[PDB]
Amino acid sequence: DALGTGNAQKQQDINHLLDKIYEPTKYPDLKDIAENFNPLGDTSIYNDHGAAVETLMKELNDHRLLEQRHWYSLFNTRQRKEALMLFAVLNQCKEWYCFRSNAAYFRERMNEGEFVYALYVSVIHSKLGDGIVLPPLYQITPHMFTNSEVIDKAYSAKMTQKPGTFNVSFTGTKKNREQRVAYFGEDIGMNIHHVTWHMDFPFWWEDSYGYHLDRKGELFFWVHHQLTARFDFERLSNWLDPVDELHWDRIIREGFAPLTSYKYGGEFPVRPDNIHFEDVDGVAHVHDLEITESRIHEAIDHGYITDSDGHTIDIRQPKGIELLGDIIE
Amino acid sequence: DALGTGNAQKQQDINHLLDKIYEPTKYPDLKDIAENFNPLGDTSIYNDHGAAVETLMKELNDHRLLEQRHWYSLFNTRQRKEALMLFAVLNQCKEWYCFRSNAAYFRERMNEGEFVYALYVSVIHSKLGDGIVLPPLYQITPHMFTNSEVIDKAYSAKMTQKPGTFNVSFTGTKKNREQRVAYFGEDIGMNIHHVTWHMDFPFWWEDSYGYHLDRKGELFFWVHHQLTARFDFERLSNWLDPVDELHWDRIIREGFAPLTSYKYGGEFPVRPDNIHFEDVDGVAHVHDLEITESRIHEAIDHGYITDSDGHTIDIRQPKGIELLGDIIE
Ligand SMILES: *[C@H]1O[C@H](CO)[C@@H](O[C@@H]2O[C@H](CO)[C@@H](O)[C@H](O)[C@H]2NC(C)=O)[C@H](O)[C@H]1NC(C)=O
Ligand SMILES: *[C@H]1O[C@H](CO)[C@@H](O[C@@H]2O[C@H](CO)[C@@H](O)[C@H](O)[C@H]2NC(C)=O)[C@H](O)[C@H]1NC(C)=O
Ligand SMILES: [Cu+2]
């Protein structure tokens, strides 16, 4: 800050914050902040009177938040909850003084993915983040977007201190699969949009956060219909045939080995091909889906979605397809 | 009687009644009653004006009631109906004169299990049975509770008239199974409670019989959750792992051979292990369960049970779990 704004400031601040992210920061201001600040002494910066801050401390305190240098999926109901607590502080800042402070204070003792994930969503949705452009995920946390080989090649570059660029590969045994329409899935661009798309309109949004995203519902319907078409075309251009729809009662015919690795975490598990779906402990039962899919499918077939009271809310009308997306994603 | 009560009377009467039960009685009063009485000549003893008596005679008459010396399960919709007709006579007696009469008259030409079963429930629920303690099932009809070997050993004792006690065994090839947590299932005590529990609050009760059992519903929820925990603990103490929940789409992995025999009836059938469930003629289809289980499971999931009119009766409240038990057992 300029005990405020700029943007080539706001901006600077951000680049510092997501610089070497798997290691304590090297930018000194970020550290005395990191040390000196107390998110709890002038609940005023906070439009909540700092209930959000006060909740994260509580957890950082009982030290019940996920550890640093460990992995993180946004599909973990707790990891998510923790990542999203950071979003609610950064969210209720009146100005840069409260953001930098917090993403500095926190950056330094909350885990990286919760952190990477909170800083981005926050920058994207909060009032205070206008001027900024976020660096591309692919360069901030490259392990999610580069291969496993280039990663190891880069680890060696570093061991030996001799530089240089390595050329990446493509997945399976090209000329042996349908890792022929790979160029599409594996692109750092689509992978970027896919993540952004869902940071722009998150599945977890409540309108307490501030405004309402408009038709995420159709927006969900549509974005995916697009990747599914866009995908189906590439498979056309490759003498391949449109894709199979998946069912829970059948084998997952087509499995792959991703060859990708986590930074802290191990390599991504692989899937053998012609496998039978198993009931996965913790998440949900396979049949649990099969019934979900029917409750779904009956709302489409009935003409109405029925809520909690047994109210039937009609969907044979234009808002239709969006109440369906709210129930389906 | 004392042309009534006592209890060391009521009581006596009962012990006479369930004495050698697979054979006509040897206590003379029980027999001239047995012969001389007519449940139909002083409809007055009866608070029904003897519609109950009058219904059993009707059936004993067309001789359409189950035969004597034959088996009986309480799961047979007719056997049950016949056993429960005895309960409704014994039920509407104004005094001992009507009970002894009937369980004497009947004891002697209705089948034993319908009889054993009616005398007990009747003694347990009817107004007139206060003073009594019932003998333990295990000694009145030992075939349901002792092994097949001890039974045959006792048959020999008898053939030869040389007495004595035999030591019973435990089931499969102990040190070969999970007939290691046998001591629990096979105990004459738990087996006694299990039967009593369901005689105290029967699945067939209507409140016409006289009063309402209070929360059989939660009472059902709970009693079984208890045997299931109590069981799960014993399997802990045996290096065994908590039990598998059963599904209709899977094999019944764990089968057993009971080695038990009926008195009149043959030995209990056995089950081979890793078998596939078959649709059993007469009872119901396997899928018939699979849908039942979903109708169930949707009431839980919806928030309401829906009756016959399509009334939704809410269950997200404290009486909750008991309307669920009324629909589930
Ligand atoms: C990776 O593919 C690139 C294409 O960008 C190759 O880099 C080339 O290096 C060759 C040496 O044979 C030069 O003739 C080209 O001018 C290079 N281009 C940049 C059109 O560097 C590279 O050879 C591949 N392999 C490494 C086996 O980097
Ligand atoms: C059944 O087990 C009992 C344990 O109650 C055994 O009865 C015992 O008989 C032995 C003879 O070896 C005596 O030493 C014990 O005093 C008995 N106890 C009653 C502690 O009788 C019996 O041996 C077993 N078998 C029959 C192979 O009855
Ligand atoms: Cu039971």
UniProtKB/Swiss-Prot annotation, chains A, B:
Cu cation A binds at H194, H198, H224. It comes from the Eukaryota. GO terms for molecular function: metal ion binding; oxidoreductase activity; oxygen carrier activity. Keywords: Copper, Disulfide bond, Glycoprotein, Metal-binding, Oxygen transport, Secreted, Transport. Hemolymph. Disulfide bonds join C93-C98. The keyword Transport applies. Glycans are attached at N167. It is found in: Secreted, Extracellular space. One of its GO terms (cellular component) is extracellular region. Its main location: secreted. Belongs to the tyrosinase family. Hemocyanin subfamily. The A chain contains two copper-binding sites. Three histidine residues are ligands to each copper ion. Hexamer of a number of different chains, of which A, B, and C have been identified. Hemocyanins are copper-containing oxygen carriers occurring freely dissolved in the hemolymph of many mollusks and arthropods. This is Hemocyanin A chain. It comes from Panulirus interruptus (California spiny lobster). The chain holds residues 1 to 329 of 657 of the full protein.
